[PDB]
């Protein structure tokens, strides 16, 4: 009667962890820019994202357990480090300063310090007194006229970016090593947890941008029919709230100040591109969102609040309470300059039962030590010209405050700073499995002798 | 077609009439003058090494066995009914992987031991003695 039979290639899979790999388009390497910011030695993208839908698969998911959020997090900041290593260091720069308040206009009136200073040059034997104009966020004073050095000059060293690289988040597909697979939850409404019938397998992911933004989402993926309410523990108040956009939101973030650059010789081979003249007038960075689309956004969001948290309550908005400048602002690059926008007016509403763009002040800062990996601060060399960057807003990052009442009102405030909510918000519904091909089935078949 | 893992929501009969397309999946993946300091290809080629070494542990199995390919293979290894007690209708009609995989983990241990024992005992030795004529 019975014997056994051995089968190969059976659909048996479990979960595992590994390192994925990139797939950049070869079009961006035509703009290689001597290592265009992210892509240095990536894989060309397969033009066929082979997606096979898998019937009768209902796998429990969580966007809070297993990903390369941490791994690709350290990969992106390791790319940040590999960018910072060979490029221009700014070691002899901790020199005391002779600065004065600028006098051109009133829109900044302050904040622009005409800082003269001694320095050396190429000929080690030589000196060089110079003056430059700096934004107030890159310096700090020290305690006749006031003196000001640099805030890192007692904590961490400083490098500036070598100006050849770009700063663009690149659409990069993320592909799996073979013998593994990537799955996809193709439903409409999915808060990140639970099962999923709509299962497809893809060899790779879609093209994914390394976006650096606080409190929101820029150029990310867009949600389905409703804006979703994604978190891990809404009963917890320490958890943030991810709201992916059904409809994207237009924004016009501008650096409206035409500028000039002064390249001063600290060499040999070293040099520093300082701030030249602001050609024209003095303005601040600002961004524009139309008020009606913002109102419909707040209304659709608060409908999802009365779908998810309670049904009948008061939803009143306050701004960020305080803290760090990157925490209090939607903080993000505009090409090469980092806008820190006062998002106080966008959190002034109240919801109980039932043609103009909104302009907010934005601030720019150059000496940055982002992700708080203290030991190496980054400096941004200046850029000429009025910079106008058209980004489109693609989601929300918010906090739930302490309740402390009997569901009277709810004050919701901005949050972020981790960027891992950008990782999870751009990397949910995907997972990593290992594959087992071996099968053994007993039956009455027998080999010969 | 079924493509890749198209026999997922199936039974091992209809799956078993497939899966060489699924079997031919170990390698499907396959700019040196800019500054020549890279980090990605170290871990990428490392993953190629790990995948190939995984497949060669698999070919270490598919080598040393009575199942040198033989993409699927029958045996001469018996079956105790104390191990499982189902019908070919109950499995081949509707039972495909899950607790089937848990049972063939028990007899991954026991029955892979029986692959070693059945291989050593007289699949080669009696083959030599009957071969020696």
């Amino acid at each position, epitope marked *: 009667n019975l014997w056994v039979t051995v089968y190969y290639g059976v659909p048996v899979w*479990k979960d595992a962890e590994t390192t994925l790999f990139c797939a950049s388009d070869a079009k961006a390497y035509e703009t290689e820019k001597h290592n265009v910011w992210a892509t240095h030695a990536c894989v060309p993208t397969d033009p066929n994202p082979q997606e096979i839908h898998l019937e009768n698969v209902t796998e*429990e998911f969580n966007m809070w357990k297993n990903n390369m959020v941490e791994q690709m997090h350290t990969d992106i900041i390791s790319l940040w480090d590999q960018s910072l290593k060979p490029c221009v260091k700014l070691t002899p720069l901790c020199v005391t300063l002779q600065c004065t308040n600028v006098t051109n206009n009133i829109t900044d009136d302050g904040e622009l310090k005409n800082c003269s200073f001694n320095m050396t040059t190429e000929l080690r034997d030589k000196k060089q007194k110079v003056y430059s104009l700096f934004y107030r966020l890159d310096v700090v004073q020290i305690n006749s006229n006031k003196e000001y050095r640099l805030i890192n000059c007692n904590t961490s060293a400083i490098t500036q970016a070598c100006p050849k690289v770009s700063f663009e988040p690149i659409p990069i597909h993320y592909c799996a090593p073979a013998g593994f697979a990537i799955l996809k939850c193709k439903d409409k409404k999915f808060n990140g*947890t*639970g099962p999923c019938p709509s299962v497809s397998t893809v060899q790779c992911t879609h093209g994914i941008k390394p976006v650096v933004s606080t409190q929101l989402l820029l150029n990310g993926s867009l949600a389905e029919e409703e804006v979703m309410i994604r978190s891990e523990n*809404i*009963t917890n108040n320490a958890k943030n709230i991810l709201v992916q956009f059904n409809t994207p939101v237009q924004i016009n973030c501008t650096r409206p100040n035409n500028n000039t650059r002064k390249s001063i010789r600290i060499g040999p081979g070293q040099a520093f591109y300082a701030t030249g003249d602001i050609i024209g007038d003095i303005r601040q960075a600002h961004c524009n969102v139309s008020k009606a689309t913002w109102n419909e956004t707040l209304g659709k969001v608060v409908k999802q609040l009365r779908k998810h948290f309670g049904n009948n309550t008061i939803i009143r908005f306050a701004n960020s309470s305080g803290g760090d400048l990157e925490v209090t602002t939607h903080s993000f690059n505009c090409g090469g300059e980092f806008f820190y926008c006062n998002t106080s007016g966008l959190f002034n509403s109240t919801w109980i039962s039932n043609n103009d763009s909104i302009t907010l002040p934005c601030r720019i800062k150059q000496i940055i030590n982002m992700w708080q990996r203290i030991g190496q601060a980054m400096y941004a060399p200046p850029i000429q010209g009025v910079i106008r960057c058209v980004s489109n807003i693609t989601g929300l990052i918010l906090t739930r405050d302490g*309740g402390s009442t009997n569901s009277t009102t709810e004050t919701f405030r901005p949050g972020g700073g981790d960027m891992r909510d950008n990782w999870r918000s751009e990397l949910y519904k995907y997972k990593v499995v290992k594959i087992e091909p071996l099968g053994v089935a007993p039956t009455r078949c027998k080999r010969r002798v | 077609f079924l493509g890749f893992l198209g026999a997922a929501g199936s039974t091992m009969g209809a799956a078993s009439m497939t899966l060489t397309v699924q079997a031919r999946n170990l390698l499907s993946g396959i700019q040196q003058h800019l500054l020549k300091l890279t980090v990605w290809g170290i871990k990428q080629l490392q993953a190629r090494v790990l995948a190939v070494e995984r497949y060669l542990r698999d070919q270490q199995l598919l080598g040393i066995w009575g199942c040198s390919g033989k993409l699927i293979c029958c045996t001469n290894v018996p079956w105790n009914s104390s191990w499982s007690n189902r019908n070919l209708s109950e499995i081949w009609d509707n039972m495909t992987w*899950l*607790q089937w995989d*848990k049972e063939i983990s028990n007899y991954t241990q026991i029955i892979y031991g029986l692959l070693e024992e059945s291989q050593n005992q007289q699949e080669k030795n009696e083959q030599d003695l009957l071969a020696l004529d």
Partner: antibody
Amino acid sequence: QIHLVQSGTEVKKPGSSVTVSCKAYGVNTFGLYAVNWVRQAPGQSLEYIGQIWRWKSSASHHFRGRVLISAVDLTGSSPPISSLEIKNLTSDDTAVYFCTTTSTYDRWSGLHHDGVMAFSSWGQGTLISVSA
Amino acid sequence: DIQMTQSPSTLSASTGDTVRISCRASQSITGNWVAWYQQRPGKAPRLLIYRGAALLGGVPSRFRGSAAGTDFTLTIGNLQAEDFGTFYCQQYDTYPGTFGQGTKVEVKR
């Protein structure tokens, strides 16, 4: 940590209905944990009444159609909660009623066998006394 | 339904003893879908062993179970004061899950 707190002891007369509550603290969601309701008659063995897994309500044939087991997911106000409602009480229903939470995220756990499972978390107990 | 017949109904032992409680099923449970529970009077049962040889996180090493065919055995070596009480075997191979009559573990005197 996860425990499980049930409603207070209730006295009921024959033919009445009753709903017992069960707050699951520490439980992250009922998408990754299943709820089983088991009663223990006085000085007796335990008996399975029903469960709710993958948001699917079910009851044992002996109690089939006589009982309704609902549960609601986590809220910002309150942890996720399950409810065991029993209609038309008889004196043979006088027993203690227990809440059960077992993780369901992993397929290989061996705690669960296609919805039929063992019971990893338990509650204090609700005494349901049925007498005229 | 599976019928779990537990044995013995009552046993007496002392601290440090090694004690064995048996539980037979009406059918044979290959998958070893059987759990063991400890219940001291008044308080809720504790899950000690699932799937025969598997100890639940936090259960002492001296609890170990064995499963062969229809018969099942819970073994408590080095009996401790905290271990005394009532024990139940539970199968979950076929719906619905069924428990045993139980086994009482009293102190020797």
